[PDB]
């Protein structure tokens, strides 16, 4: 996260670290949506242009973390993956359309002060909250700059959702309805973005109607990190929820 701050303890109890076994590496963020299911970006697991094709045994998920590098004894829980599910129309060839994947855990993780699932939006929640100007929150252990470049602890930044024509006009990439963009404009003064290693993490919003946190996006892509006139692009969780629901219903 560029131009963010240190998370508070227990601020983002659905935050998951995708951790490579060998070499020991932060791969991506992810999020806890139930005791057995983790949500992430497809490109965290499959990205042929960079020879990325992670199997279940290549990774661990670390849940309840705050420190990036420490083993947080008595706090974090570490789960092995039972199965990876990538959206079958995930478009790695062009624009990362439908950049979403599910991971079923081997065993249920126990909830705690530090470990708790986020809600997924329904149509009404999406319609209410996904509006230009409305701010969501992005968290992660990714780099602090495009290029100390790496954070000691989990980072947080609040960013406004951006008007769809402004998103389109910032890039040559073909945008789809399965994406939205967020971030401040040059004239707004405030800054912030996701960066390398924040991929797959959640963009969340707090419903003012029921005081619950909803994951509206997944950190997908951008052009650099925190560049003026560029924006971060997020997978539109609600648009792909029918797929989410179908995978969970048949495999869960």
């Amino acid at each position: 996260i560029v131009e963010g701050s240190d998370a508070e303890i227990g601020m983002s109890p659905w935050q998951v670290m995708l951790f490579r076994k060998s070499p020991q590496e932060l791969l991506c963020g992810a999020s806890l949506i139930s005791d057995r299911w983790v949500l992430t970006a497809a490109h965290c697991l499959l990205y042929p242009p960079w020879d990325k094709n992670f199997t279940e045994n290549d990774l661990l998920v670390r849940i309840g973390k705050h420190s990036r590098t420490r083993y947080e004894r008595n706090i974090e829980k570490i789960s092995m993956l039972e199965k990876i599910y990538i959206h079958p129309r995930y478009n790695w060839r062009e624009n990362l359309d439908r950049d979403i994947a599910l991971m079923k855990l081997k065993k249920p993780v126990a909830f705690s002060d530090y470990i708790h699932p986020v809600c997924l939006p329904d149509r009404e929640t999406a319609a209410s909250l996904l509006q230009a100007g409305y701010k969501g929150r992005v968290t992660g252990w990714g780099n602090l700059k495009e290029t100390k470049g790496q954070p000691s602890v989990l980072q947080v930044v609040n960013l406004p959702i951006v008007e769809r024509p402004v998103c389109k006009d910032s890039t040559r990439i073909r945008i789809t309805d399965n994406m939205f963009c967020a971030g401040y404009k040059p004239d707004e003064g405030k800054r912030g973005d996701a960066c390398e290693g924040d991929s797959g993490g959640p963009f969340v919003m707090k419903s003012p109607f029921n005081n619950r946190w909803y994951q509206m996006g997944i950190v997908s892509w951008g052009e650099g990190c925190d560049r003026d006139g560029k924006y971060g692009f997020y997978t539109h969780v609600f648009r792909l929820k029918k797929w989410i629901q179908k995978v969970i219903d048949q495999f869960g």
Partner: peptide, 10 residues
Amino acid sequence: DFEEIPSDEI
């Protein structure tokens, strides 16, 4: 870089 994860905790 990353502190070792104990084997019994996985």
